[PDB]
């Protein structure tokens, strides 16, 4: 079974950039629902697979991608943030950013643009393309996970579902994105980059 990971920090550790109420709801309510629904759905899938029921397997795909994706995305997201985050990357990672995007600022600009431009609910991602060996920016709708649907290895994710910022920034996504740069855990992003 899958389980809700514990936050590596306190709910209010990202203040004033992301207030405690959002973190608490996001983690204990939203993420929890996905994990629970993921376990229920995998349960039904194992049953459909055992009986070789193809129709059931196919009918179950949206639920599995949605809840499975939700679990994967949020688990990575929590580790992407840190009260000691912010600033800029250093070393091999920063070098790859300059190489693939021109400069750190152009990178920020393109990731911010891809994130603000999502129509409806979704995610903005900085991913690694193993085939080409270069960094790449992508946006995924709803809870569609990056690796599972595009093949890219996720390094940094930005949740742009309205529940991720509405209580604090209302309809102004740009403000939310501007603020989230201050708590990004580049140390974690770097580890994910090195791992591949």
Residue 90 near which of its own copies, Mn ion, K ion, none (CB within 5-8 Å, type-dependent): none
What would the two tokens of residue 168 be? Answer: 């604090």
Residue 170 found at the interface with its own copies (CB under 8 A): yes
Check: CB of residue 44 under 8 Å from CB of residue 56: yes
Residue nearer to Mn ion on the CB measure, 48 or 138:
138
Interacting partner of 193 out of its own copies, K ion, Mn ion, none (Cβ under 5 to 8 A depending on kind) = none
Contact criterion met (CB below 8 Å) for 125 and 156: yes
Using alpha carbons only, how large is the chain's radius of gyration in Å?
17
Q: Least distance from C-beta 3 to K ion, angstroms?
A: 6
Classify 138 as helix, strand or coil: strand
Count of residues that interact with its own copies, criterion CB under 8 A: 20
Residue 21 neighbours by CB distance under 10 Å:
12
Binding site annotation covers 74?
yes
2 assigned binding-site residue: no
101 is an interface residue for Mn ion by CB under 5 A: no
Binding-site residue ranges for Mn(2+):
26, 74, 159, 163
């Amino acid at each position: 079974k899958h389980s809700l990971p514990d936050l590596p920090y306190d709910y209010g550790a990202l203040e004033p950039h992301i207030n405690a109420q959002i973190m608490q709801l996001h983690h204990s309510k939203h993420h929890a629902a996905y994990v629970n629904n993921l376990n229920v759905t995998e349960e039904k899938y194992q049953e459909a697979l055992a009986k070789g029921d193809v129709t059931a397997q196919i009918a179950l795909q949206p639920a599995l991608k949605f809840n499975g994706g939700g679990h994967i995305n949020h688990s990575i997201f929590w580790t992407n943030l840190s009260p000691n985050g912010g600033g800029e990357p250093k070393g091999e990672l920063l070098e790859a950013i300059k190489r693939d995007f021109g400069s750190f600022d152009k990178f920020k600009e393109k990731l911010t643009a891809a994130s603000v431009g999502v129509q409806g609910s979704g995610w903005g991602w900085l991913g690694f393309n193993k085939e080409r060996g270069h960094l790449q920016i992508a946006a995924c709708p709803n809870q569609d996970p990056l690796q599972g649907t595009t093949g890219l290895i996720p390094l940094l994710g930005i949740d742009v579902w309205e529940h991720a910022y509405y209580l604090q920034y209302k309809n102004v996504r740009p403000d939310y994105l501007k603020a989230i740069w201050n708590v990004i855990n580049w140390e974690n992003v770097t580890e994910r980059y090195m791992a591949c």
